[PDB]
Design a protein around this motif. Sequence first.
Motif, PDB file in Angstrom:
ATOM      1  N   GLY A   2       0.679  -1.232   0.036  1.00  0.00           N
ATOM      2  CA  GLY A   2       0.015   0.110   0.058  1.00  0.00           C
ATOM      3  C   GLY A   2       0.830   1.207   0.166  1.00  0.00           C
ATOM      4  N   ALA A   3       0.382   2.412  -0.847  1.00  0.00           N
ATOM      5  CA  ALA A   3       0.999   3.576  -0.943  1.00  0.00           C
ATOM      6  C   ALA A   3       0.154   4.863  -0.627  1.00  0.00           C
ATOM      7  N   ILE A   4       0.812   5.910  -0.314  1.00  0.00           N
ATOM      8  CA  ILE A   4      -0.237   7.256  -0.705  1.00  0.00           C
ATOM      9  C   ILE A   4       0.466   7.995  -1.849  1.00  0.00           C
ATOM     10  N   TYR A   5      -0.246   8.505  -2.767  1.00  0.00           N
ATOM     11  CA  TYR A   5      -0.030   9.202  -3.949  1.00  0.00           C
ATOM     12  C   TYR A   5      -0.467  10.530  -3.824  1.00  0.00           C
ATOM     13  N   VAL A   6       0.257  11.643  -3.457  1.00  0.00           N
ATOM     14  CA  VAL A   6       0.121  12.904  -3.298  1.00  0.00           C
ATOM     15  C   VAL A   6       0.926  13.934  -4.316  1.00  0.00           C
ATOM     16  N   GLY A   7       0.521  14.508  -5.233  1.00  0.00           N
ATOM     17  CA  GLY A   7       1.255  15.297  -6.150  1.00  0.00           C
ATOM     18  C   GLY A   7       2.057  14.624  -6.930  1.00  0.00           C
ATOM     19  N   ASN A   8       3.421  14.898  -7.060  1.00  0.00           N
ATOM     20  CA  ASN A   8       4.500  14.060  -7.817  1.00  0.00           C
ATOM     21  C   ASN A   8       5.204  13.213  -6.964  1.00  0.00           C
ATOM     22  N   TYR A   9       4.368  12.567  -5.397  1.00  0.00           N
ATOM     23  CA  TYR A   9       5.002  12.006  -4.478  1.00  0.00           C
ATOM     24  C   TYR A   9       4.246  10.513  -4.465  1.00  0.00           C
ATOM     25  N   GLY A  97      -6.474  -3.167  17.446  1.00  0.00           N
ATOM     26  CA  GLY A  97      -6.895  -3.543  16.115  1.00  0.00           C
ATOM     27  C   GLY A  97      -6.294  -4.571  15.606  1.00  0.00           C
ATOM     28  N   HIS A  98      -6.662  -5.221  14.713  1.00  0.00           N
ATOM     29  CA  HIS A  98      -6.138  -6.502  13.940  1.00  0.00           C
ATOM     30  C   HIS A  98      -5.091  -6.084  12.943  1.00  0.00           C
ATOM     31  N   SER A  99      -4.084  -6.826  12.733  1.00  0.00           N
ATOM     32  CA  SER A  99      -2.974  -6.509  11.912  1.00  0.00           C
ATOM     33  C   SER A  99      -2.191  -7.650  11.951  1.00  0.00           C
ATOM     34  N   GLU A 100      -1.572  -8.126  10.626  1.00  0.00           N
ATOM     35  CA  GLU A 100      -0.775  -9.162  10.410  1.00  0.00           C
ATOM     36  C   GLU A 100       0.199  -8.680   9.448  1.00  0.00           C
ATOM     37  N   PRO A 101       1.538  -9.291   9.333  1.00  0.00           N
ATOM     38  CA  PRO A 101       2.764  -8.787   8.606  1.00  0.00           C
ATOM     39  C   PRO A 101       2.195  -9.222   7.109  1.00  0.00           C
ATOM     40  N   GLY A 102       1.836  -8.012   6.323  1.00  0.00           N
ATOM     41  CA  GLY A 102       1.497  -8.054   5.081  1.00  0.00           C
ATOM     42  C   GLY A 102       0.298  -6.868   4.868  1.00  0.00           C
ATOM     43  N   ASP A 103      -0.464  -6.552   6.012  1.00  0.00           N
ATOM     44  CA  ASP A 103      -1.101  -5.368   6.245  1.00  0.00           C
ATOM     45  C   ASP A 103      -0.337  -3.993   6.242  1.00  0.00           C
ATOM     46  N   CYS A 104       0.893  -3.796   6.101  1.00  0.00           N
ATOM     47  CA  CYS A 104       1.779  -2.752   6.050  1.00  0.00           C
ATOM     48  C   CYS A 104       1.463  -2.094   4.853  1.00  0.00           C
ATOM     49  N   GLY A 105       1.149  -0.795   4.906  1.00  0.00           N
ATOM     50  CA  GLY A 105       0.683  -0.062   3.688  1.00  0.00           C
ATOM     51  C   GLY A 105      -0.757   0.343   3.558  1.00  0.00           C
ATOM     52  N   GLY A 106      -1.548  -0.006   4.325  1.00  0.00           N
ATOM     53  CA  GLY A 106      -2.868   0.270   4.528  1.00  0.00           C
ATOM     54  C   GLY A 106      -3.125   1.419   5.192  1.00  0.00           C
ATOM     55  N   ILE A 107      -3.975   2.521   4.393  1.00  0.00           N
ATOM     56  CA  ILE A 107      -4.146   3.872   5.073  1.00  0.00           C
ATOM     57  C   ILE A 107      -4.795   4.162   6.011  1.00  0.00           C
ATOM     58  N   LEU A 108      -4.730   4.854   6.887  1.00  0.00           N
ATOM     59  CA  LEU A 108      -5.577   5.378   7.989  1.00  0.00           C
ATOM     60  C   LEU A 108      -5.800   6.774   7.498  1.00  0.00           C
ATOM     61  N   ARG A 109      -7.153   6.994   7.679  1.00  0.00           N
ATOM     62  CA  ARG A 109      -7.981   8.171   7.404  1.00  0.00           C
ATOM     63  C   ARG A 109      -8.701   8.715   8.565  1.00  0.00           C
ATOM     64  N   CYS A 110      -8.877  10.255   8.569  1.00  0.00           N
ATOM     65  CA  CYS A 110      -9.968  10.822   9.184  1.00  0.00           C
ATOM     66  C   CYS A 110     -10.697  11.692   8.284  1.00  0.00           C
ATOM     67  N   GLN A 111     -11.786  12.520   9.026  1.00  0.00           N
ATOM     68  CA  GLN A 111     -12.552  13.356   8.178  1.00  0.00           C
ATOM     69  C   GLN A 111     -11.765  14.385   7.283  1.00  0.00           C
ATOM     70  N   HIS A 112     -10.495  14.601   7.726  1.00  0.00           N
ATOM     71  CA  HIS A 112      -9.458  15.668   7.004  1.00  0.00           C
ATOM     72  C   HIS A 112      -8.719  15.103   5.817  1.00  0.00           C
ATOM     73  N   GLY A 113      -8.461  13.661   5.742  1.00  0.00           N
ATOM     74  CA  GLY A 113      -7.978  13.000   4.928  1.00  0.00           C
ATOM     75  C   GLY A 113      -6.823  11.824   5.444  1.00  0.00           C
ATOM     76  N   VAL A 114      -5.875  11.615   4.740  1.00  0.00           N
ATOM     77  CA  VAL A 114      -4.824  10.832   5.053  1.00  0.00           C
ATOM     78  C   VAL A 114      -3.861  11.107   6.210  1.00  0.00           C
ATOM     79  N   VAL A 115      -4.098  10.299   7.220  1.00  0.00           N
ATOM     80  CA  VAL A 115      -3.288  10.460   8.407  1.00  0.00           C
ATOM     81  C   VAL A 115      -1.688   9.628   8.282  1.00  0.00           C
ATOM     82  N   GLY A 116      -1.835   8.381   7.880  1.00  0.00           N
ATOM     83  CA  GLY A 116      -0.770   7.552   7.761  1.00  0.00           C
ATOM     84  C   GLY A 116      -1.018   6.123   7.209  1.00  0.00           C
ATOM     85  N   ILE A 117       0.152   5.319   7.258  1.00  0.00           N
ATOM     86  CA  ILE A 117      -0.041   4.066   6.966  1.00  0.00           C
ATOM     87  C   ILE A 117       0.332   2.980   7.886  1.00  0.00           C
TER      88      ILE A 117
END
Length: 139
Positions: A2-9, A97-117
């Motif tokens: 999983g990745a975050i795509y913002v502008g040219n990044y 919350g649940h997580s397994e190795p393989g879940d790295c990259g999944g996005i965390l979001r709030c009402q304001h947008g992307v928080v982290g992965i």
Amino acid sequence: SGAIYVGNYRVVNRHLATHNDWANLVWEDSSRDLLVSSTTAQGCDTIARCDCQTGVYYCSSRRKHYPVSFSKPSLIFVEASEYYPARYQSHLMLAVGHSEPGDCGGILRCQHGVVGIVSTGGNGLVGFADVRDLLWLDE
Ligand SMILES: Cc1ncnc(C)c1CC(=O)N1CCC[C@H](C(N)=O)C1
Ligand SMILES: [Zn+2]
């Protein structure tokens, strides 16, 4: 994955970065498990600029989004892995919350947008590498 795509990044877990991510490296931080690389196509993800402690994350190992309460970005000790020796990882936020190795990259979001992965997990807890402080992703 999983990745975050913002502008040219493209923002990914540093332990999951590809040869192409390293060949077009913009910034990388082992202590944070983050790597940002440049892209030709323009990204449309909105990054949150806030101090929210509630959000929704994507959990690949269950194909479900889950609502979570998460701690403020901090130095949390992370157990040794094939990617890093046992160290403190900075800018990390924990949630029950649940997580397994393989879940790295999944996005965390709030009402304001992307928080982290997703970046760490285990024992019924999940860690998110925060990106809200990276003000340069928007310029
Ligand atoms: C063990 C385990 N259990 C459950 N969920 C997960 C995501 C994990 C995987 C995990 O915590 N790792 C492995 C890859 C590097 C990570 C890091 N940021 O140092 C640490
Ligand atoms: Zn927010």
